[PDB]
Paper text:
Here, we present single-crystal X-ray structures of CheY from Pyrococcus horikoshii (PhCheY) in two different crystal forms, and the protein purification, crystallization and X-ray data collection of CheF (PhCheF). CheA autophosphorylates and subsequently donates the phosphate to CheY, yielding phosphorylated CheY. We observe PhCheY to have a domain-swapped, pseudo-dimeric fold, which may reflect inherent properties of the protein fold but is not likely to be of physiological relevance.
In striking contrast to all of the known CheY structures, PhCheY adopts an open conformation in both crystal forms, with the two subdomains of a given subunit directed away from one another. In both of the two PhCheY structures solved in this study, two polypeptide chains assemble by pairing the N-terminal subdomain of a chain with the C-terminal subdomain of the other chain; i.e. the α3/β4/α4/β5/α5 part of the fold of each subunit packs with the β1/α1/β2/α2 part of the other subunit [Fig. 1(a)]. The other two subunits, C and E, interact with their own crystallographic symmetric molecules for the dimeric assembly with swapped domains. In all cases, the rotational movement of the C-terminal domain was calculated after the initial superposition of the N-terminal domain. The connecting region between the β3–α3 loop is partially disordered for the two subunits C and E. For both crystal forms an unambiguous trace of the electron density in the β3–α3 loop was verified by a feature-enhanced map (FEM; Afonine et al., 2015; shown in Supplementary Fig. S2 for the P2 crystal form). While CheY has been broadly characterized in structure and function, a subdomain swap, as observed in PhCheY, has not been reported before. Therefore, a physiological role for a domain-swapped dimeric PhCheY has to be ruled out.
Author numbering:
A (entry chain A), B (entry chain F), E (entry chain F), F (entry chain A), G (entry chain D), H (entry chain B), ...: 2 to 118
C (entry chain C), D (entry chain C), K (entry chain E), L (entry chain E): 2 to 56, 59 to 118
């Protein structure tokens, strides 16, 4: 069978891939999160999917909060896309120190890195 | 000057890594999701984190539902960890056909793969 | 001579208690399940524990029904903490589950999905 | 729409029956254990079965008590057909067993042997 | 002229076998207990059976009790077949320390041997 | 450890012996019925006993009855020891055709074999 | 006109061979089971194949039984993988004297060969 | 010792043969299935047989499918017994060109051979 | 006067060696773990042994972690038996790239070596 | 490739070494325990490491027992840290003749050496 | 495209066979030594041969050891069919031999005779 | 009583070692070929040596095949350090070589060049 292997841990995808291949199956693709598994399913139409039941769920804001609990002096720069300004605002409130804009202009990224350090 | 780079898109991590390295910084690690960013922060104690504001949020159950919308005959095997049985149950209800237990015992994985196919 | 009596059936605890008391022993406490027996053991330090096992399981019944009728429609009832068994029941052919305590609307929604 | 309701608790069968009937379904039969559900399935050919699983087990409780007190004295209660579980309980540290239905003299003889 | 020889004492079967063979008969099988004599009769359809009137009668439970009288610290592991669980239970009650399951899986046999020792 | 292996089937003693030896244990003796296990325990004082839960229980009379059910024309000669005359009598009643006496005198055994055939 | 004849019954192969030859065809090969038919097809590239739909295939246990009928003193070692213990047990019961485990450890193979001889 | 080596996998026979020969034994023959092992036993009278406990069985239908993969223009006639019709149907669907029932008339066998060519 | 010095700490072996030599003794060998002390005793037959009671012993997983600290691009294949899957999983998580199973099949060892390189 | 082979069993290192060499790889070193594998890695910078996941650990007490089996007149002094007294006691019971606590005075070490000789 | 594969290591023949087959070639035969390769060549007439023969012999080793130590004690380990070589080894200074397959008892008897 | 065990098969060294040790001897070393046995003899000075060397070479096989078929196509499989032998094999008529460890791609490239 043609198998899509889904797990956030690269090494776990590799272990499962080895077992599946030894049993005669072909791993036709891999994914590390939910959204990616859906897209790869559409594209590859595998006979079978294996999926870790823990898929990454933690949003940027929560990650900022957790890092700030571990280290109140942490320095975090957010990357924004357009339309997510509300979330960046909240990330800054929760302790992030700045942000940079995609697509990256190298000079502006570096200027912001220097300001934050 | 020691930087942890966090983004779900590999090519975006590579572009940012190149800019940071050219400017004299050392990229000491990378992460593609929130949970991984937190763990890598604890472990690496970087001077600086760059973090995409959109981190993967889709849980396993939602990924199962979405795959089932695309293909009502999809064959999906969940991987369970201990303590997540409620979520596996719901994944099965939402259309997953079976599950395998970590740590993997190859013979049982294959037996479950064969039952599902 | 100090005895902790464990059985899920109240009347069976009472019958055993009567026999033990007539023979000169003191029933110092009672329990109706394993977890409760452990707690009472810590607390009472009895000389002796009597324990009844409560044992065809649900999973086998699901398998047997599916052998008789491969199109059988079975909905499991679970409470919180029994999810491992429901998982196995679903794997063995059950089509869904409903949660105790029952919320009528959710029971009916699941009944309709399964039919 | 024809439903076989399976649960060891009578009152839970009645609560589910009420909800199913109010939603327009017919409860065509009831059972309190797996074996009985299989027999009733053959006989009634229901469109749908609801089945409650009845699940810390006795063996784990024996193990936990033995961790707390390696000299604990535990006597299992078995009926005919549960011998596999008693065997495992004895292996996990229980010192004996008594048979239901209880014969007072044999219970006391076993209590004395174990003490 | 085709003879099934039944006796619990090997040397008695050998003496009888020698006499029968010298007299021109063919010993087509041997058995050392009752159950074995019945099975060998079905299978061999001998013209004649010789059978010691004392066949072994001691059940497993009695053998456990007798060993325990000789040595109260004896360590005995029962082998169970399916359907004999009541007898194993009673053997454990009478002083046996554990049991192993046929067919033997070597790792589990050894684990049980180690637990008992 | 020093192990006494008890099982009515020779091949099962050999299989268990192989597993025990591979794990480092020494099989110091074997027995095929209950009575023999007790005697060997006394004599060998093993650290450990393995014992099949089904030990032969069927007496001579039952074996005669069972053989006669299988083949009403079966020809069975009993071997008697002194003191077991009641059992031989019952074996004859249940369909055995004769008996021979231990210790064997070859001539008398053969005379009885010829009478019965 | 070049024909491969496939049937598990030798007599049926002989009858078909005779008829085909009398009609002017050349029987270029024969096979008595499926696997053999495939191999002979690759190798001989016949114009035509005749093939029985049912080839009955003798398993290891049956082969042990048949060899033991031919020679009651036969010495047979089974080659097994892990997980086949029920079948090994049955093979031993039917008269096999031992077993060796794949993948092979040469030392253990030889040890088992020596024990059996 | 003189050894008959029985295994369906050629490479496994070769590995066992090498180990046996290095230890000083003589592999006097090989077989790849049960029936062949029996015949070789009769003929060679080996001191010892090594025999894989699982022989894989290719059925007629699979053999037809495999031949058709090797040569899509293969010409196959199912010469079979009555009562197999579902399997013959499937063989015909999988590419077999003909069928006859045994016992047959020579004339009709040849007529079917001619139709198929 | 011929002394074997046993201690896991190199500095402690050096200090003891110096003191023993200054006092007129000859240090004929050193060992840093138990197994090594035994072997060196057999071989050197010293008049005297000094021995630390506690030698801490590094397991496979710790060795993987330590090698990965020294060289983050290290390529490590674990050698495991069946039943150790939890430990292999952890070794892979700690940075090992694969595993091979004892007893060795040479072909699979090489296949895994090639995959990892 | 250049390979470092790590396994506590010499014979297992030799089997793996043979397979690797036959396939064209170079075994550049060997180790029998974790600590030794780390040191050899630093020194050899191999392309690849094969490493048994379980390293067996001989403790000091076992090493004392083993030495005493080899030579019942062995002279062993336990040079140890404070807080180990139960284990030293057992070592003395198992035949060690002396003990000193580290850190020590040279003079007292030598005095204990002299007492034991 | 028809290939004869020659290598003394079975697993190396198998690896090369797999690579050749994946590339579209047919492995028509195998051999593990030179003499066997020649015979298989005659018989199979392959388009192509791959060959890895891996080749100091026992007799030379005996001679060299005897030069180093004229009192050396050497036992040859031989199978049937190698008697000419054993003869020569004994002439060159070896003191005995043991025959494969080994009986432990005969090995020990020969070791004792030679010492 | 101090024994050097010489055999190209690891498992045969191990079997002989076990028998020798059970009989009271000490195996002080092992070797898998002649040259190694000589070196180990010098170094260990054993009381006793057991030796099984098992020895047509590749070059002769090439020559014989070329006599049978002057258009034969032969590829040598070599490791590093055997270049002198490959040279001679090519001179005697072999058309190419492949180097261990194999890369599949290089094997195929060489097979295609030679055909």
């Amino acid at each position: 069978a043609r198998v899509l292997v889904v797990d956030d841990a690269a090494f776990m995808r590799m272990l499962l891939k080895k077992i599946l291949t030894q049993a005669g199956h072909e791993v036709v693709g891999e994914a590390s999160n939910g959204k990616e598994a859906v897209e790869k399913y559409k594209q590859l139409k595998p006979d079978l999917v294996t999926m870790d039941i823990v898929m990454p769920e933690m949003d940027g804001i929560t990650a900022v909060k957790e890092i700030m609990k571990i280290d109140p002096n942490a320095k975090i720069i957010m990357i924004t896309a357009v339309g997510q300004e509300a979330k960046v605002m909240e990330a800054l409130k929760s302790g992030a120190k700045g942000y940079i804009v995609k697509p990256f202009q190298a000079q502006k990224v570096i200027e912001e890195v220097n300001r934050v350090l």
